[PDB]
Amino acid sequence: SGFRKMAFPSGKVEGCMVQVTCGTTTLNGLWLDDVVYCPRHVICTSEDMLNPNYEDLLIRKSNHNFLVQAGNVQLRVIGHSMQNCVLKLKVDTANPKTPKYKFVRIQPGQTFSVLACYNGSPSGVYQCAMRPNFTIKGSFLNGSCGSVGFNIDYDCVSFCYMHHMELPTGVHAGTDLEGNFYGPFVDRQTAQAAGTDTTITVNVLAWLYAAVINGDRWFLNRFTTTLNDFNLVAMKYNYEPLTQDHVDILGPLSAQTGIAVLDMCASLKELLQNGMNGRTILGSALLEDEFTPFDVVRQCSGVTF
Amino acid sequence: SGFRKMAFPSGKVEGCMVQVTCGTTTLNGLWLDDVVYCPRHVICTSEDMLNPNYEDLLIRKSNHNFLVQAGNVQLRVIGHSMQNCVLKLKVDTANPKTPKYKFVRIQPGQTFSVLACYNGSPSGVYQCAMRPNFTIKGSFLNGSCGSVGFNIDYDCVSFCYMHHMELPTGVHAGTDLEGNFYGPFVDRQTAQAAGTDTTITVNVLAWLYAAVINGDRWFLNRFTTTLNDFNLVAMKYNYEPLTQDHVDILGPLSAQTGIAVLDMCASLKELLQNGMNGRTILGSALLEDEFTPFDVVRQCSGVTF
Numbered sequence A, B: 001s002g003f004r005k006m007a008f009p010s011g012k013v014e015g016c017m018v019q020v021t022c023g024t025t026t027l028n029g030l031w032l033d034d035v036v037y038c039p040r041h042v043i044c045t046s047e048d049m050l051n052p053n054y055e056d057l058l059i060r061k062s063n064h065n066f067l068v069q070a071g072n073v074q075l076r077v078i079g080h081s082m083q084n085c086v087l088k089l090k091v092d093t094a095n096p097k098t099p100k101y102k103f104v105r106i107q108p109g110q111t112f113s114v115l116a117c118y119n120g121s122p123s124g125v126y127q128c129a130m131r132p133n134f135t136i137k138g139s140f141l142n143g144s145c146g147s148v149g150f151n152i153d154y155d156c157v158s159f160c161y162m163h164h165m166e167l168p169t170g171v172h173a174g175t176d177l178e179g180n181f182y183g184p185f186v187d188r189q190t191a192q193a194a195g196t197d198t199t200i201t202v203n204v205l206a207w208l209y210a211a212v213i214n215g216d217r218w219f220l221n222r223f224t225t226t227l228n229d230f231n232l233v234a235m236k237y238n239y240e241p242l243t244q245d246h247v248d249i250l251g252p253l254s255a256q257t258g259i260a261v262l263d264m265c266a267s268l269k270e271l272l273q274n275g276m277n278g279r280t281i282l283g284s285a286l287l288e289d290e291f292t293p294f295d296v297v298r299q300c301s302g303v304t305f
């Protein structure tokens, strides 16, 4: 028993982290096969980042301008190209620790483990949910760019996030591994703000199922509801509309606990209208929406990798 | 910016996890050099665990009764010995992924990363604080025993916890890597309960410093206090007495923020007497005590490994 925010084991990703230095700017890169992926603002000076012309900056750089270091070993750059907001550096050495991997673009509401890195060295790992406003509530300092987010399916590492920038509210924005930003953000040091966020309803329900599985059942009421009714009450509290796809995705948890999704919706409806009355659910005084239905099943069934 | 519960990168520990099977019982083991460490109740049947005589059970086992598997490779056991509640299995192969490591017995209030494992395979990683009652608020299922807790200092992995059992309240208890349990618990399936826990005061203060560093300063009041006065107010709320050693340990954070420890104690004194008034600190509606002063510095300064 027990339910904890749980990151994937980072070993497979730790073996892919390198340091990328261009001039005086240093950040992290992902070394997969003979290609190093890193944010393209590695080629910017502190002045360029205010309004950079990345295509122009990349002209004046040759392969030798990019210092790639895996540990103490320098990786010789034999090619460079820009794909959206990511820079692809071809190196003369294929990473022998390359895991089976994919590049995926996750959807809002899905979670992933972030391996925070500095100077190509892993610092720590934590879980993040892609917020509906396409930000993540991460912990990133100077030099953390290039740190990647990932999920692990058996032996396959699905990279889905590379860190680029921090927004005024302290939240963070980045790109997929193809360099496409999540959300309407750009890799320029200019006025940008995250849109108004919303609560990932399906994840709250998943978390309530986790609570029941772990013996925390005080919030279960006698009632049921309809998908239409619940969504009208949840809309007021800035909850995403619960779709039938979300109901279907919760099926496994509903079947395991014997609590219909719409019965759990009634309990959440009451929690949203009446509050928690000073009580906790899984030790939390707030409703948690950063656990996907998969995260709950994975943790309550012990899926390994 | 941003402050998150952050685990150490688990790669160095993932390379040491093996599966240990004795008869029908399977759990995890730590493979360091040519020795596999695992809980001794691997040698118990479901019946033995109610009142096991481990010394007796170990008589009837020979080296070949212990099936150790690193991945698909079986490690041949060439020796076995029992140290307290841990079993040491000598194998004919030294783990080539053995990191620089130590065995340490952490103190109550210190944190460590847990690598949850099943069948010798890492499932996930999360941070845990050794509670004053010598339990941890973990997430463990059947077959999770042998999962270890650790800290990483540069390149040295300090193993400090091996999981053994779960207590009635859903909290968890285990041993150091020498087999000595944390707390008054025994590896027997019998009536055992965790003592009344207490709040790790120094960690709350560290967490309040983290809040200030991250711009959350609404709780800072104009007052100071004395170590004696604060401790008398904090005692009522089940807070550990704050020692001068704790004040000294907070020095780095006090110096970085320019807020004296006793000034922060006054702010915590007010938070304990008046509550948070529906507000959050670092997104939390409760005061967090699972962040050590080191954890805060490590995360707010970007210490890597």
Ligand SMILES: *C(C)[C@H](C[C@@H]1CCNC1=O)NC(=O)[C@@H]1[C@@H]2[C@H](CN1C(=O)[C@@H](NC(=O)C(F)(F)F)C(C)(C)C)C2(C)C
Binding pocket: A027, A041, A044, A049, A140, A141, A142, A143, A144, A145, A146, A163, A164, A165, A166, A167, A168, A172, A186, A187, A188, A189, A190, A191, A192, B001
């Ligand atoms: C990557 C190394 C670094 C990570 C951030 C530094 C502190 N915390 C982080 O997450 N990214 C940057 O420095 C990016 C880069 C330059 C400016 N920048 C920012 O993150 C800045 N934010 C913004 O400009 C915005 F729009 F998000 F508000 C700032 C946090 C440094 C002010 C690039 C876009 C090239």
Ligand SMILES: *C(C)[C@H](C[C@@H]1CCNC1=O)NC(=O)[C@@H]1[C@@H]2[C@H](CN1C(=O)[C@@H](NC(=O)C(F)(F)F)C(C)(C)C)C2(C)C
Binding pocket: A001, B027, B041, B044, B049, B140, B141, B142, B143, B144, B145, B146, B163, B164, B165, B166, B167, B168, B172, B186, B187, B188, B189, B190, B191, B192
């Ligand atoms: C290790 C494989 C396993 C981990 C627990 C199973 C579920 N969650 C866990 O953390 N440990 C055990 O099964 C230990 C073993 C047997 C009984 N046991 C327990 O954890 C049991 N708890 C207790 O007896 C006590 F005292 F903590 F309440 C129980 C949770 C299975 C009932 C040993 C002590 C040999």
